[PDB]
RNA sequence: GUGAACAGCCUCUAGUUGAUAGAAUAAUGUAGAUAAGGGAAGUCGGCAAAAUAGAUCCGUAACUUCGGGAUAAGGAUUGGC
RNA sequence: CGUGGAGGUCAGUGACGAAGCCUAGACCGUAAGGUCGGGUCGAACGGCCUCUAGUGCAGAUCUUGGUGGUAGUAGCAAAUAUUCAAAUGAGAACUUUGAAGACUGAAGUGGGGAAAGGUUCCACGUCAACAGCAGUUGGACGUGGGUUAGUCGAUCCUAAGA
RNA sequence: GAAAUUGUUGAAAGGGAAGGGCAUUUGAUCAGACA
């Protein structure tokens, strides 16, 4: 008949279907445009989401009421031990799209990745790559022509890297394997780089720097079967209504005589792939560095790990990326940090932050103390102690 | 084995509700044979069925 | 083979009963323990001593103590041959408090 | 006797029956079929597992709005169940077959279940009282169960016909030649 | 026993412990609760819900058939020893 | 063309298998139908000329009986609540006994009665059906036992009324 | 001891119904007529 009152539809049709992702590891749908003038490097990085804390910093924003004043800001921390490079994979252009034509693998493969190739490690004979590993033997001949062929053809080159999950409090023990586009120099220079980095190791500082704008690709936390009200942000129907009220009252007109794809319906909520962009790196931490959590202004020797340790995660004993704000996914989930697809100028992007203080009190409650030392100071001797 | 009849009989001979007759689980054969009031009477006499004490309701706080 | 052992454990009933409905807590305890014995003695057959029952229901359905010190005994089975030759008896150990004890073996003779 | 269609060698088979059994016809139909053709010994151990909930019975006909279980993967199926009363009636008749088989003097190691057939015994009426004064039939669906165990036997040899060939004057002349020509 | 009390709530005597069961805790329900700031803007309509309440003391308007209206309204107090 | 029954006839068919029923076997007929084979079966039946009618079904929200899909689906969610062990038994979540945890809370889930029921009481045996899971239990099934009055009622008296 | 309806066995077909008409291929099956 015509609405009555106009109101915007509930929820975005660009995030359909609202099904469960095909995997925990969200896919990198797109890599940055290649500029073959610059050196070879990764264009993304694997990590694990540890947790969140607070930051204090002066603000550099002429014109703003808060120029030259402190602000407090939430941040996420993702555990980021060096990634290890075990393969190169070379794609060619076709009128049917990009197709892979070979993969060359490292001679030796950490049990971690090998574990990924299996569904029952303990029972297995662990025979993975054992014949491939041979290929190196004979002078190299066969591996060479594979590198060679990548170079001859291939419009793009990706590396095969994986995570050193053992350097991580997780139980999960089976590592994460993934393709990172290489975006440095010429095709040949690319594969050379890869070949050189077989069984060799790469760290975030070689791909991210302070104040850089990055994106995060991950699978969203899960919530199971969700009624229409919370899943689409539909009105609660009045208290008086029979047969329940977290619903849509009208599921469609009488014609088209079909429920339509565009109305809200109960169903899976969360465990979705998201590619969420513009997260500024506020810190790139080093694992072999006490005073991880310390600052030019703070100076106390302490690492980022909160008292009692990251709730539901653990300790952070590796390099981390600290990113302003929050990020898709949850504590313990694999997560891809990615180089941005454009060169932002934003002013907001470009600001060169410099932390003043990183919160480090217990997240497991109303944390009153940064360190056990501070806690001793304030409290005095207890019936335990010396 | 089914001693409800004896337990009922027990309650009446003794003068007390069934909630307080004790049928000795180890004398379960001997008890079953007791079909009469006279038989239960003997079984009470020698400890095979005992009266079981009243649950106390103390007036000490009321005092 | 077999083995025949007696050890004394303490079981955290608290985290196992956490969440459970009040009219199900003492009953859950019974089950939860049974499952605890089987995880340790490997034995399907698990019998609970009538005294252990009392220990458990000692404060009514929803008042189960957070920690019970038990003694589990893996024993051989007799008569009409059950599925498995082995079984566990569980019993309460009379202890001032069940707080603070690691698990011990009972040298049996 | 007079069982259903069988193709088997009666001299090397034993049989068993139950009639009018208060088990669900639909359920024990499904559980009889998970056994059909099985090696007797593998089948008996199988039912035993079903009861332990370690393998399931695949429901393939009477199964709409059944649950789902990983225990049906082994049979390429998503819906499967663990019909206790059905299992225990069927494994009851199975035991009987074995006994009869032992009596006939048949190698108990070659025994497979070659026939297994449930169908429908007469129904049995109780009634339920419905709202507003009404009555509904509340009914048992009992079953007849029948099975036959036969001893596996190898081979089959050959032999059949000889196909009598019929060639025209031009067909047997080319043949007459072909060889007069070459080999 | 508490209490004004044959109320509610706990108990002795007596009697029951019968009501398919197990495992989980998605949506939506039924039944039971709570919510910052605002406070009827919701709705035909305060529907539903919330608020009030016992006892002692103080204080109590219009109007009236002088009997009421009246626990009007409005306040303070209340344990243990 | 086809059915039930009747007069006539073929000295018709048949326990060496009548009738009926089954049969993606055969044959005649444009068709209603007719014929045969094989299997099943068990006592009667058919061609031809006539006579006769309670004579031919897809329907009537047709009548009676039977049967499906729905479907192993809706469901078996009110009355706070159950637990350990033993015994018995082919079999025990549910029977008996012991222990424990509770409940009804004397306006009772206690102890008796009036109307009504009619053996349900009680013992022994006992599970095919019944108790919308179960069952060794039962108000079930089988076989028995059991109700004692000068004083308790009736009986007597009168009431509305008959 | 029909039918509806059901179990098994054997054979066959099945990309949002199935069944039907004229026609032929293929498979299975079968009558007759020949001397
Ligand atoms: Mg408009
Ligand atoms: Mg999938
Ligand atoms: Mg190749
Ligand atoms: Mg919700
Ligand atoms: Mg909203
Ligand atoms: Mg939201
Ligand atoms: Mg709505
Ligand atoms: Mg309404
Ligand atoms: Mg916290
Ligand atoms: Mg909870
Ligand atoms: Mg039969
Ligand atoms: Mg069907
Ligand atoms: Mg069906
Ligand atoms: Mg279902
Ligand atoms: Mg359903
Ligand atoms: Mg469906
Ligand atoms: Mg399926
Ligand atoms: Mg009903
Ligand atoms: Mg009625
Ligand atoms: Mg030739
Ligand atoms: Mg009573
Ligand atoms: Mg009920
Ligand atoms: Mg339930
Ligand atoms: Mg509020
Ligand atoms: Mg206000
Ligand atoms: Mg208004
Ligand atoms: Mg107002
Ligand atoms: Mg309005
Ligand atoms: Mg109005
Ligand atoms: Mg209005
Ligand atoms: Mg109201
Ligand atoms: Mg309030
Ligand atoms: Mg007034
Ligand atoms: Mg005072
Ligand atoms: Mg005629
Ligand atoms: Mg006629
Ligand atoms: Mg007639
Ligand atoms: Mg036919
Ligand atoms: Mg013919
Ligand atoms: Mg014949
Ligand atoms: Mg005949
Ligand atoms: Mg005869
Ligand atoms: Mg005529
Ligand atoms: Mg007529
Ligand atoms: Mg017609
Ligand atoms: Mg008809
Ligand atoms: Mg019709
Ligand atoms: Mg018609
Ligand atoms: Mg009809
Ligand atoms: Mg009908
Ligand atoms: Mg069923
Ligand atoms: Mg159901
Ligand atoms: Mg209901
Ligand atoms: Mg029960
Ligand atoms: Mg109590
Ligand atoms: Mg009470
Ligand atoms: Mg009361
Ligand atoms: Mg009752
Ligand atoms: Mg009486
Ligand atoms: Mg009666
Ligand atoms: Mg009785
Ligand atoms: Mg029975
Ligand atoms: Mg009955
Ligand atoms: Mg029943
Ligand atoms: Mg039964
Ligand atoms: Mg009787
Ligand atoms: Mg009698
Ligand atoms: Mg008198
Ligand atoms: Mg008299
Ligand atoms: Mg017959
Ligand atoms: Mg065919
Ligand atoms: Mg044709």
Tab-separated table of N, CA, C and O (backbone and C1' of nucleotides) in Angstrom, chain E residues 22-65:
chain	number	residue	atom	x	y	z
E	22	G	P	16.565	-38.709	34.285
E	22	G	O5'	17.609	-38.933	33.090
E	22	G	C5'	18.544	-39.991	33.124
E	22	G	C4'	19.449	-40.001	31.907
E	22	G	C3'	20.135	-38.698	31.524
E	22	G	O3'	21.276	-38.419	32.338
E	22	G	C1'	19.250	-39.715	29.590
E	23	A	P	22.002	-36.971	32.298
E	23	A	O5'	22.337	-36.813	30.759
E	23	A	C5'	23.481	-37.398	30.192
E	23	A	C4'	23.751	-36.698	28.907
E	23	A	C3'	23.850	-35.210	29.035
E	23	A	O3'	25.109	-34.809	29.515
E	23	A	C1'	22.481	-35.743	27.204
E	24	A	P	25.393	-33.251	29.808
E	24	A	O5'	25.633	-32.677	28.345
E	24	A	C5'	25.702	-31.285	28.178
E	24	A	C4'	25.043	-30.860	26.909
E	24	A	C3'	24.630	-29.405	26.869
E	24	A	O3'	25.729	-28.550	26.623
E	24	A	C1'	22.894	-30.756	26.042
E	25	U	P	26.150	-27.511	27.782
E	25	U	O5'	25.113	-26.325	27.527
E	25	U	C5'	24.979	-25.821	26.207
E	25	U	C4'	23.610	-25.298	25.919
E	25	U	C3'	23.293	-23.957	26.544
E	25	U	O3'	22.669	-23.162	25.570
E	25	U	C1'	21.576	-25.509	27.009
E	26	A	P	23.550	-22.153	24.729
E	26	A	O5'	22.588	-21.757	23.542
E	26	A	C5'	21.909	-22.716	22.771
E	26	A	C4'	21.644	-22.109	21.435
E	26	A	C3'	20.417	-21.237	21.305
E	26	A	O3'	20.612	-19.937	21.833
E	26	A	C1'	20.542	-22.682	19.472
E	27	A	P	19.379	-18.995	22.312
E	27	A	O5'	18.443	-18.763	21.031
E	27	A	C5'	18.905	-18.006	19.923
E	27	A	C4'	17.993	-18.124	18.732
E	27	A	C3'	16.577	-17.614	18.931
E	27	A	O3'	16.489	-16.214	18.847
E	27	A	C1'	16.519	-19.716	17.841
E	28	U	P	15.777	-15.382	20.029
E	28	U	O5'	14.272	-15.852	19.924
E	28	U	C5'	13.578	-15.710	18.703
E	28	U	C4'	12.263	-16.436	18.726
E	28	U	C3'	11.454	-16.319	19.996
E	28	U	O3'	10.839	-15.062	20.144
E	28	U	C1'	11.394	-18.547	19.211
E	29	G	P	10.296	-14.621	21.576
E	29	G	O5'	8.927	-15.402	21.757
E	29	G	C5'	8.538	-15.872	23.035
E	29	G	C4'	7.807	-17.186	22.943
E	29	G	C3'	7.147	-17.639	24.249
E	29	G	O3'	5.808	-17.171	24.404
E	29	G	C1'	8.570	-19.349	23.451
E	30	U	P	5.422	-16.071	25.504
E	30	U	O5'	5.116	-16.925	26.804
E	30	U	C5'	3.999	-17.796	26.836
E	30	U	C4'	4.199	-18.904	27.836
E	30	U	C3'	4.411	-18.491	29.280
E	30	U	O3'	3.218	-18.128	29.941
E	30	U	C1'	5.957	-20.176	28.699
E	31	A	P	3.126	-16.670	30.580
E	31	A	O5'	3.848	-16.884	31.972
E	31	A	C5'	3.401	-17.889	32.853
E	31	A	C4'	4.492	-18.319	33.796
E	31	A	C3'	5.325	-17.252	34.485
E	31	A	O3'	4.667	-16.593	35.537
E	31	A	C1'	6.729	-19.000	33.770
E	32	G	P	5.080	-15.085	35.952
E	32	G	O5'	6.509	-15.204	36.641
E	32	G	C5'	6.697	-15.911	37.843
E	32	G	C4'	8.154	-15.950	38.211
E	32	G	C3'	8.831	-14.622	38.401
E	32	G	O3'	8.412	-13.970	39.571
E	32	G	C1'	10.280	-16.038	37.221
E	33	A	P	8.502	-12.367	39.676
E	33	A	O5'	10.078	-12.156	39.718
E	33	A	C5'	10.642	-10.918	39.387
E	33	A	C4'	12.129	-11.020	39.370
E	33	A	C3'	12.842	-9.760	38.943
E	33	A	O3'	12.915	-8.801	39.978
E	33	A	C1'	13.746	-11.558	37.758
E	34	U	P	12.493	-7.275	39.655
E	34	U	O5'	13.871	-6.664	39.142
E	34	U	C5'	15.076	-7.113	39.739
E	34	U	C4'	16.275	-6.736	38.924
E	34	U	C3'	16.222	-5.378	38.267
E	34	U	O3'	16.414	-4.326	39.201
E	34	U	C1'	17.077	-6.963	36.751
E	35	A	P	16.262	-2.782	38.768
E	35	A	O5'	17.682	-2.500	38.079
E	35	A	C5'	17.961	-1.316	37.358
E	35	A	C4'	18.848	-1.561	36.161
E	35	A	C3'	18.632	-0.547	35.059
E	35	A	O3'	19.405	0.617	35.245
E	35	A	C1'	18.609	-2.761	34.162
E	36	A	P	18.729	1.922	35.885
E	36	A	O5'	19.882	2.991	35.760
E	36	A	C5'	21.153	2.741	36.342
E	36	A	C4'	22.205	3.414	35.530
E	36	A	C3'	21.769	4.774	35.042
E	36	A	O3'	22.182	5.766	35.953
E	36	A	C1'	22.498	3.467	33.210
E	37	G	P	21.135	6.660	36.755
E	37	G	O5'	20.608	7.658	35.657
E	37	G	C5'	21.508	8.594	35.112
E	37	G	C4'	20.982	9.195	33.841
E	37	G	C3'	19.528	9.586	33.833
E	37	G	O3'	19.305	10.768	34.554
E	37	G	C1'	20.055	8.522	31.791
E	38	G	P	17.901	11.001	35.281
E	38	G	O5'	16.851	11.116	34.090
E	38	G	C5'	16.974	12.110	33.092
E	38	G	C4'	15.988	11.863	31.990
E	38	G	C3'	14.549	11.701	32.419
E	38	G	O3'	13.936	12.923	32.792
E	38	G	C1'	15.079	10.098	30.746
E	39	G	P	12.812	12.944	33.943
E	39	G	O5'	11.685	12.009	33.369
E	39	G	C5'	10.925	12.388	32.227
E	39	G	C4'	9.960	11.291	31.888
E	39	G	C3'	8.848	11.118	32.903
E	39	G	O3'	7.731	10.568	32.246
E	39	G	C1'	10.162	9.177	32.859
E	40	A	P	6.387	11.425	32.099
E	40	A	O5'	5.542	10.578	31.051
E	40	A	C5'	6.027	10.371	29.725
E	40	A	C4'	5.017	9.670	28.868
E	40	A	C3'	3.577	9.942	29.261
E	40	A	O3'	2.746	9.790	28.131
E	40	A	C1'	4.018	7.664	29.531
E	41	A	P	2.475	10.980	27.086
E	41	A	O5'	3.874	11.210	26.361
E	41	A	C5'	3.922	11.717	25.035
E	41	A	C4'	5.245	11.439	24.355
E	41	A	C3'	5.426	10.056	23.787
E	41	A	O3'	4.719	9.924	22.567
E	41	A	C1'	7.435	10.792	24.832
E	42	G	P	3.425	8.986	22.513
E	42	G	O5'	4.031	7.556	22.862
E	42	G	C5'	4.967	6.950	21.982
E	42	G	C4'	5.112	5.484	22.256
E	42	G	C3'	3.870	4.632	22.023
E	42	G	O3'	3.676	4.270	20.668
E	42	G	C1'	4.721	4.155	24.149
E	43	U	P	2.350	4.745	19.893
E	43	U	O5'	1.153	3.955	20.579
E	43	U	C5'	1.087	2.552	20.622
E	43	U	C4'	-0.010	2.139	21.544
E	43	U	C3'	-1.299	2.895	21.319
E	43	U	O3'	-2.086	2.320	20.301
E	43	U	C1'	-0.755	2.973	23.612
E	44	C	P	-2.877	3.230	19.249
E	44	C	O5'	-4.104	3.805	20.094
E	44	C	C5'	-5.182	4.498	19.488
E	44	C	C4'	-6.233	4.893	20.492
E	44	C	C3'	-5.769	5.094	21.918
E	44	C	O3'	-5.311	6.419	22.098
E	44	C	C1'	-7.653	3.673	21.899
E	45	G	P	-4.177	6.781	23.169
E	45	G	O5'	-4.745	6.151	24.506
E	45	G	C5'	-5.453	6.920	25.451
E	45	G	C4'	-5.990	6.027	26.531
E	45	G	C3'	-4.976	5.507	27.530
E	45	G	O3'	-4.705	6.436	28.560
E	45	G	C1'	-6.408	3.743	26.810
E	46	G	P	-3.232	7.058	28.724
E	46	G	O5'	-2.448	5.890	29.447
E	46	G	C5'	-3.039	5.243	30.570
E	46	G	C4'	-2.633	3.796	30.684
E	46	G	C3'	-3.013	3.155	32.001
E	46	G	O3'	-3.226	1.764	31.832
E	46	G	C1'	-0.639	3.466	31.867
E	47	C	P	-4.236	0.966	32.790
E	47	C	O5'	-4.035	-0.540	32.337
E	47	C	C5'	-5.065	-1.227	31.628
E	47	C	C4'	-4.517	-2.288	30.702
E	47	C	C3'	-3.529	-3.245	31.303
E	47	C	O3'	-4.193	-4.242	32.029
E	47	C	C1'	-2.751	-2.527	29.185
E	48	A	P	-3.618	-4.718	33.432
E	48	A	O5'	-2.126	-5.136	33.091
E	48	A	C5'	-1.760	-6.476	32.796
E	48	A	C4'	-0.288	-6.558	32.477
E	48	A	C3'	0.661	-6.281	33.618
E	48	A	O3'	0.858	-7.438	34.372
E	48	A	C1'	1.332	-5.028	31.753
E	49	A	P	1.051	-7.380	35.942
E	49	A	O5'	2.359	-6.522	36.111
E	49	A	C5'	3.612	-7.118	35.894
E	49	A	C4'	4.647	-6.055	35.803
E	49	A	C3'	4.909	-5.296	37.081
E	49	A	O3'	5.785	-6.017	37.918
E	49	A	C1'	4.640	-3.773	35.318
E	50	A	P	5.786	-5.837	39.515
E	50	A	O5'	6.394	-4.373	39.732
E	50	A	C5'	7.694	-4.018	39.274
E	50	A	C4'	7.949	-2.540	39.428
E	50	A	C3'	7.688	-1.957	40.812
E	50	A	O3'	8.839	-1.995	41.612
E	50	A	C1'	6.542	-0.676	39.194
E	51	A	P	8.704	-2.079	43.203
E	51	A	O5'	7.954	-0.732	43.613
E	51	A	C5'	8.642	0.499	43.738
E	51	A	C4'	7.673	1.621	43.988
E	51	A	C3'	6.873	1.580	45.284
E	51	A	O3'	7.608	2.078	46.385
E	51	A	C1'	5.425	2.059	43.499
E	52	U	P	7.690	1.286	47.789
E	52	U	O5'	6.309	1.650	48.503
E	52	U	C5'	5.819	2.980	48.567
E	52	U	C4'	4.429	2.961	49.125
E	52	U	C3'	4.229	1.994	50.270
E	52	U	O3'	4.553	2.614	51.482
E	52	U	C1'	2.506	1.717	48.676
E	53	A	P	4.960	1.773	52.771
E	53	A	O5'	3.662	0.950	53.144
E	53	A	C5'	2.513	1.561	53.697
E	53	A	C4'	1.420	0.539	53.804
E	53	A	C3'	1.590	-0.458	54.925
E	53	A	O3'	0.307	-0.938	55.266
E	53	A	C1'	1.757	-1.592	52.868
E	54	G	P	-0.243	-0.633	56.717
E	54	G	O5'	0.350	-1.787	57.624
E	54	G	C5'	-0.281	-3.042	57.723
E	54	G	C4'	0.420	-3.865	58.750
E	54	G	C3'	0.436	-3.264	60.148
E	54	G	O3'	-0.720	-3.606	60.889
E	54	G	C1'	2.616	-3.944	59.529
E	55	A	P	-1.643	-2.476	61.517
E	55	A	O5'	-0.842	-1.999	62.788
E	55	A	C5'	-0.683	-2.854	63.897
E	55	A	C4'	0.523	-2.447	64.694
E	55	A	C3'	0.466	-1.066	65.316
E	55	A	O3'	-0.316	-1.041	66.505
E	55	A	C1'	2.591	-1.412	64.313
E	56	U	P	-1.169	0.263	66.889
E	56	U	O5'	-0.068	1.268	67.452
E	56	U	C5'	0.632	0.954	68.642
E	56	U	C4'	1.727	1.947	68.922
E	56	U	C3'	1.351	3.414	68.851
E	56	U	O3'	0.710	3.883	70.012
E	56	U	C1'	3.401	3.050	67.736
E	57	C	P	-0.386	5.039	69.849
E	57	C	O5'	0.482	6.324	69.447
E	57	C	C5'	1.094	7.134	70.437
E	57	C	C4'	2.083	8.094	69.841
E	57	C	C3'	1.515	9.264	69.070
E	57	C	O3'	1.045	10.305	69.904
E	57	C	C1'	3.281	8.307	67.848
E	58	C	P	-0.328	11.074	69.573
E	58	C	O5'	0.140	12.244	68.604
E	58	C	C5'	1.358	12.907	68.823
E	58	C	C4'	1.838	13.573	67.568
E	58	C	C3'	0.813	14.304	66.744
E	58	C	O3'	0.416	15.526	67.315
E	58	C	C1'	2.248	13.114	65.320
E	59	G	P	-0.992	16.212	66.928
E	59	G	O5'	-0.962	16.288	65.341
E	59	G	C5'	-0.366	17.371	64.665
E	59	G	C4'	-0.509	17.200	63.179
E	59	G	C3'	-1.921	17.222	62.603
E	59	G	O3'	-2.416	18.525	62.410
E	59	G	C1'	-0.773	15.375	61.743
E	60	U	P	-3.976	18.850	62.560
E	60	U	O5'	-4.665	18.084	61.333
E	60	U	C5'	-4.830	18.711	60.072
E	60	U	C4'	-5.071	17.718	58.959
E	60	U	C3'	-6.507	17.293	58.699
E	60	U	O3'	-7.242	18.255	57.965
E	60	U	C1'	-5.114	15.401	58.635
E	61	A	P	-8.570	18.946	58.556
E	61	A	O5'	-9.155	19.694	57.286
E	61	A	C5'	-8.474	20.811	56.782
E	61	A	C4'	-8.788	21.014	55.341
E	61	A	C3'	-10.249	20.932	54.948
E	61	A	O3'	-10.973	22.103	55.277
E	61	A	C1'	-8.994	19.659	53.445
E	62	A	P	-12.592	22.131	55.321
E	62	A	O5'	-12.985	21.813	53.803
E	62	A	C5'	-12.872	22.825	52.823
E	62	A	C4'	-13.319	22.358	51.472
E	62	A	C3'	-14.799	22.087	51.296
E	62	A	O3'	-15.547	23.267	51.114
E	62	A	C1'	-13.547	20.340	50.312
E	63	C	P	-16.730	23.650	52.133
E	63	C	O5'	-17.832	22.554	51.839
E	63	C	C5'	-18.222	22.249	50.513
E	63	C	C4'	-18.684	20.822	50.408
E	63	C	C3'	-19.785	20.391	51.365
E	63	C	O3'	-21.081	20.800	50.953
E	63	C	C1'	-18.084	18.756	51.316
E	64	U	P	-22.292	20.872	52.008
E	64	U	O5'	-22.408	19.397	52.577
E	64	U	C5'	-23.134	18.392	51.888
E	64	U	C4'	-23.251	17.152	52.728
E	64	U	C3'	-24.049	17.321	54.008
E	64	U	O3'	-25.430	17.127	53.787
E	64	U	C1'	-21.983	16.269	54.484
E	65	U	P	-26.521	17.718	54.796
E	65	U	O5'	-26.678	16.618	55.933
E	65	U	C5'	-27.898	16.518	56.639
E	65	U	C4'	-28.359	15.099	56.757
E	65	U	C3'	-27.361	14.133	57.358
E	65	U	O3'	-28.078	13.299	58.253
E	65	U	C1'	-28.094	13.306	55.272
